């Protein structure tokens with residue numbers, strides 16, 4: 179077991195999970211230069227001499243390290259209002275990735291400076307077939323960049339658009355979602371916003387989760403709360419809605435609610451709590467006992483109905499509170515086509531036909547930004563606008 | 576393109592982006608941000624709380640002062656002290672120079688240790704004391720050097736009457752050592768007995784390079800300030816105060832001259848009871864230089880001394896080290912210039928333990944309160960000149 183203090187420090191430098199690993203240490207030096215280098219501050223001798231020594235070296239480094247210009251944008255596949263996701267090709271390696279941008283200016287402006295750490299940890303270290311991998315995370319003074327495996331199948335929102343979905347497809351996406359969720363729960367995170375938008379497909383037609391921006395680390399009892407605004411409460415559980423009003427905390431069972439909702443939308447074509455307005459949808463969720471109706475549209479399966487209803491109940495009696503297993507054993511999941519262990523080796527309901535490695539078919543065209551980039555007021559003293567982003571850099575090796 | 580090369584940039588002990596400089600960066604940053612006034616900036620407060628745990632940990636993992644037992648305090652330079660220290664685990668004994676960050680700020684003069692670090696680390700010479708590790712905390716820089724139980728020429732000079740035979744030896748060694756330094760591109764200035772140390776076998780090493788400077792093309796330097804030890808300072812360097820001039824490596828040779836005088840005469844040539852007096856006699860050396868009336872001293876001894884204590888442009892060594900080596904004062908049957916360090920030193924120190932302090936004067940401790948920095952209301956970047964100082968030998 180024993181290691182010397184020198185050995186231990188060496189491990190800190192080399193460990194991708196360490197915040198003092200070499201790449202993170204360059205980040206600091208970089209940021210510090212960014213934030214110090216200004217005529218006003220250069221009047222300080224310590225600062226002026228320091229920037230003279232290191233700057234020539236800092237230019238070598240900024241030249242050497244990965245950068246936005248190592249990639250060319252093929253297209254824009256999504257917009258998050260903190261930035262865009264865009265299809266890219268690496269110039270030297272020819273390889274094709276999806277790339278998320280985050281505006282540093284926007285983040286300082288609105289706060290929301292701390293929120294991307296969990297997404298980073300998850301996509302970097304999950305090492306799951308159920309989770310989109312981040313290959314590189316790097317940055318400059320303007321932006322964060324997350325370079326991710328591209329998922330040409332598109333999301334489940336697109337799928338529900340182009341296909342009516344039989345219980346046989348539903349069961350399958352549902353099961354994969356169960357697994358990705360469980361994977362994420364086992365790393366100690368609660369996803370907390372689980373939607374068809376966050377479910378994408380690889381060239382095989384298999385599902386991965388993306389967009390972990392809402393994810394929070396659970397503690398001991400496996401609970402959390404965050405202050406975070408949520409676009410639509412369509413898939414959001416009642417106890418999460420209550421929590422936003424200060425009331426209290428909650429556990430991973432909130433994610434199983436979303437899945438209950440996801441199923442209903444796949445079979446029935448509609449969100450169960452759908453209303454013309456946010457307020458209406460909101461009331462309906464809080465009303466869920468009396469507000470949840472199975473369709474005009476059909477009789478659909480006794481078993482499907484029962485799973486959906488088991489997920490869409492109140493949290494204390496809700497399916498999945500006793501763990502993933504009682505979910506897996508639900509009779510809704512019985513079939514001849516796949517078993518839980520073999521699921522990803524099955525052939526998928528929809529296997530994308532793709533013209534090229536650049537095929538955008540399953541995504542909507544994203545027109546343009548072409549907006550003029552906002553800049554900060556020149557510091558009269560040190561404001562450290564780069565500090566929140568220090569240690570973000572990651573290279574998978 | 577394959578690329579990285581940052582592997583080498585990170586691994587090069589001479590690289591400024593190497594791992595230890597990178598860690599010095601983060602360490603300096605935290606020290607300099609941690610303050611009530613500065614934590615009112617949220618950017619800062621948030622960064623400090625994020626990296627605090629990991630920073631406390633690094634500080635402990637990396638080499639620190641607590642890793643050493645202080646045995647005796649063997650010197651004080653008013654920029655700090657020099658201690659004989661023993662590593663608490665390895666049990667190895669080392670010399671450690673403490674440089675105060677507070678003082679190198681107050682007096683400015685924050686840049687001088689770089690060349691000293693550079694030399695002691697990478698010289699790889701039997702003529703130059705070797706730097707093993709360098710580290711720092713908020714208060715100090717720490718240089719850890721090979722220990723030199725032989726002591727310095729001043730101690731030797733007080734305990735003995737140096738015969739010409741010995742002076743030939745020590746001068747010759749100083750000469751070879753200086754040459755090596757010159758060949759690395761530096762002018763020492765500051766050549767005085769106090770910086771000449773004897774190893775366990777009694778051979779000579781140069782230390783305290785804090786005053787060194789790097790030559791250019793013609794091998795000169797441009798300096799308008801005069802550098803230390805009034806007794807040993809050359810006319811050029813004295814005169815260079817007040818904007819004057821720019822000069823080469825023969826100011827060191829001048830000090831070798833003073834050194835030789837001191838050993839054989841037992842006094843300094845420019846001694847007076849004020850430095851003011853000494854500066855003056857130095858300017859007037861052409862007159863003020865005299866040997867004692869009694870004297871029994873070889874003519875060629877006095878000649879060599881006189882060849883050094885002349886003006887720079889006629890100064891022995893101005894042509895090359897060779898004209899010094901060929902001087903008749905060095906003529907003898909015992910040793911040759913290339914083998915000289917393999918010969919048997921005139922004094923081989925007798926030592927009790929590896930810890931033996933007998934050849935160093937008695938010094939004690941500060942006993943004073945640490946005079947420390949005022950809390951900033953804004954980023955002063957006070958640690959920034961020290962980033963990249965840390966060194967580990969392997």
Ligand SMILES: COc1cccc([C@@H](C)NC(=O)Nc2nc(-c3ccncc3)cs2)c1
Nearest residue numbers: 257258260261262263276327328329388389
């Ligand atoms: C708040 O900041 C944001 C910046 C950009 C985008 C977003 C939104 C749309 N959510 C998201 O992560 N969507 C993502 N889609 C992928 C993706 C898509 C296709 N192929 C590979 C990856 C990653 S994240 C938010």
Ligand SMILES: COc1cccc([C@@H](C)NC(=O)Nc2nc(-c3ccncc3)cs2)c1
Nearest residue numbers: 650651652654655656670721722723782783
């Ligand atoms: C520049 O500011 C100063 C700060 C503290 C001390 C000094 C003096 C004592 N000179 C010096 O470096 N002396 C040296 N002694 C050694 C040494 C001693 C014993 N064994 C090996 C080396 C190196 S430098 C100056």
